[PDB]
């Protein structure tokens, strides 16, 4: 026939890919970082507890001034905290209480939001009327909206559970670029620090690296065995870390095109909900289903602490832009700020 | 107090935000959500439109019954986003009862009944749904009584039913074949029902079942069990 010939061509291309990836794996990250001294043990104590949510917290994001937060929850609200003094700046009532993502613009003006309603709401905080109006409602996806990350004050890239990502134009409202190629849902997104590339982790046991200027998939990374609930770049944009559901984080590398490490412990049997590196890249925090985060040494896999202060599953967390804090958020409607 | 004027005014604004949050969380603590997930081919539209005339994304229908507010979250019908539909009291299933002898369109081999029962298995046997009290309607009972006195059923399924020419026999057979799918289902009973040609008793029955569920759940926080 003809379809089987193209399938054989695809199979031999995948074999060429596997041989090219195997030809470069001369050493590992363990056989090289086995001489530097470990980090020791890292005690982190809760510094603040931010109360006021009345339901499960599903996402959060840090401002780029390292002080202001934002937190979405199934209460139906979107609160903007002041993390230094624990008081609330704004509280935004959502039109649909089924919210599963959150963002915070890199300039501080706007705030994005999204959920099961298939739309991405852009809110304008610095109005001259003293309110927080819905500045835009971006529609055009066909499945639930899992993550959204601001790029400029005019462009936003987001990922939905209809096997697509999309780069929008907040002024007009139309999809500038659509990103296709996955097979299952898409539940995670992370932008490179230079904001020309980004990576997503699908419900397909795969991650992909797109470039927002062209609209094509550069590379794809396999190796997991379950969903990929989270993703995050390395602070220099040449590696990322996925957090799966089979109780294992990993560390891929965009130039070696392979997998480097495998952060997994035998006590751990529950899936990761959120990973986030540190400022220098020597830690890898990972919130788990068993109610507590971890702190993985990201050059030798040796676990180096535990942030156990929650009493329910910990949702997305985030390390500040200047480095001074971590901020987890869990299903008991409490944020915490470790340090 | 070591706070300046703007700091004290910001703390006052925060306390006012907190008061408004507490009020909106009092208004939504006496709210009863009822998820609605049928089987597609089971006349969901007919029940929905009759409930709408008597009173892309996810849908939602607000109403009130006997001074209690109900939300009906009709999801537009997978893995990890049904874990937000916990703390949603009394999921409300819905099946067409007269669909025991037809066969699916895209699959001309398997029966529609076993497919609906497998959906029921995957939904009830979830772990996060171990605090929600499944209701179970069966529409088109008049279709069932029309199509039960003309055909037999022992030739369809191998499970023992008995005589094929009545109503109560096939009804108890259907309720047993649907109920038997659970696995150690305590603290969440299965209020089966039987909805004929459409009427006004449906929402009264749903209110009775949700009242029973909230009673059995208040009867454990008070240690009064």
């Amino acid at each position, epitope marked *: 026939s003809e379809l089987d010939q193209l399938r054989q061509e695809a199979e031999q291309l995948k074999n060429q890919i596997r041989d090219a990836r195997k030809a470069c794996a001369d050493a590992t990250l363990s056989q090289i970082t086995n001489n530097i001294d470990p980090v020791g043990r890292i005690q982190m104590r809760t510094r603040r507890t931010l109360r006021g949510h009345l339901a499960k917290i599903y996402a959060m994001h840090w401002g780029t001034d390292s002080r202001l937060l934002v937190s979405a929850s199934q209460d139906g609200k979107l609160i903007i905290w002041d993390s230094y003094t624990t008081n609330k700046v704004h509280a935004i009532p959502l039109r649909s209480s089924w919210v599963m993502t959150c963002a915070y613009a890199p300039s501080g003006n706007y705030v994005a939001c999204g959920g099961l309603d298939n739309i991405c709401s852009i809110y304008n905080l610095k109005t*001259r*009327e*003293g309110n927080v109006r819905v500045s835009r409602e971006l529609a055009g996806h066909t499945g639930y909206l899992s993550c959204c990350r601001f790029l400029d004050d005019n462009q936003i890239v987001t990922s939905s559970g209809d096997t697509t990502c999309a780069l929008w134009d907040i002024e007009t409202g139309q999809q500038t670029t659509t990103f296709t190629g996955h097979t299952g849902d898409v539940m995670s997104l992370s932008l490179a620090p230079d904001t020309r590339l980004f990576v997503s982790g699908a419900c397909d046991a795969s991650a992909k690296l797109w470039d927002v200027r062209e609209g094509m998939c550069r590379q794809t990374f396999t190796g997991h065995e379950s969903d990929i609930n989270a993703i995050c770049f390395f602070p220099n944009g040449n590696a990322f870390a996925t957090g799966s559901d089979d109780a294992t984080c990993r560390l891929f590398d965009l130039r070696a095109d392979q997998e480097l490490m495998t952060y997994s412990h035998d006590n751990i049997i529950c899936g990761i909900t959120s990973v986030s590196f540190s400022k220098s890249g020597r830690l890898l925090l990972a919130g788990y289903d068993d109610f507590n985060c971890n702190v993985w040494d990201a050059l030798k896999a040796d676990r180096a602490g535990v942030l156990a202060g929650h009493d329910n599953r910990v949702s997305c967390l985030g390390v500040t832009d200047d480095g001074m804090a971590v901020a987890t958020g869990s299903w008991d409607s409490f944020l915490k700020i470790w340090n | 107090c070591t706070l300046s004027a*703007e700091d004290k*005014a*910001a703390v*006052e*604004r925060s306390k006012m935000i907190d008061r408004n949050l507490r009020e909106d969380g009092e208004k939504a603590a006496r709210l009863v959500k009822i998820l609605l997930l049928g089987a597609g081919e089971s006349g969901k539209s007919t029940f929905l439109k009759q409930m709408r005339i008597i009173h892309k994304g996810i849908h939602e229908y607000d109403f009130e019954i006997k001074n209690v507010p109900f939300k009906m979250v009709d999801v537009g019908g997978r893995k990890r986003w049904f874990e937000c539909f916990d703390s949603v009291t009394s999921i409300l299933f819905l099946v067409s009862s007269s669909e025991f002898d037809q066969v699916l369109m895209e699959d001309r081999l398997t029966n529609r009944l076993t497919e609906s029962l497998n959906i029921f298995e995957t939904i009830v046997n979830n772990r996060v749904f171990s605090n929600v009290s499944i209701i179970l309607f069966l529409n088109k009972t008049d279709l069932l009584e029309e199509k039960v006195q003309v055909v037999s059923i022992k030739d369809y399924f191998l499970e023992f039913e008995g005589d094929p020419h009545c109503l109560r026999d096939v009804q108890k057979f259907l309720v047993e074949c649907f109920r038997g799918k659970r696995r150690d289902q305590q603290q969440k009973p299965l209020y089966h029902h039987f909805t004929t040609a459409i009427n006004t008793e449906n929402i009264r029955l749903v209110f009775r079942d949700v009242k029973d569920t909230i009673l059995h759940d208040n009867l454990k926080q008070l240690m009064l069990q």
Partner: single-chain antibody
Amino acid sequence: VQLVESGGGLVQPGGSRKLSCSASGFAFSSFGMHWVRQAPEKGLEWVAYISSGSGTIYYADTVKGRFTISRDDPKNTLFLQMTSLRSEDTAMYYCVRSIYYYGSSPFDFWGQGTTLTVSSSDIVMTQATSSVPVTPGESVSISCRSSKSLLHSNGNTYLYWFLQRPGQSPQLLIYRMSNLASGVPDRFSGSGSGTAFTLTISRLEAEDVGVYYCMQHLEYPLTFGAGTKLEL
């Protein structure tokens, strides 16, 4: 955004009045409101402040007990009940909105004011001069010296700068000594630290002539300055 006031006119001494302030165009329910008087030729002076709900209320030490500020949210109005009108109360009265959170810009929008004529601890802030001659195209400077250190322990000085054009209502120009207000062209800069503050202007225009006032916001009463006149 619009504030407009009413209730002026000639008053007999020893009487009583009520001033009204209607606010159309913004969210009045979440905006603290100040009254600010102004003598015939003697510059601005704070009068009273009422909070965003109906909580903290403050008065100047010369109008405490006589006056009474109040607000009505569903009608979007603000009232000042003045009792025992003395001869030193003839003035033009302005409303001022101000919202307080992290990073806000209080004293946003001044109203238009009513004229009210009758028949017949405390931070002290001084201005440099009373009139300077300038030319359009020259970079100028205005100095305002406090008496207590306005640099609070959290790092932000609380000195503001307003500009009043001839025949108009003053507008916010600079808040917290460095931050520029909205709609202000990139020519005004704020500098200094501690108890010596400075506003520097680049090449000026025909719309930069007026009187410049420096406020403080550490503690009530908020004490304005004497004003420096920018004449051509």
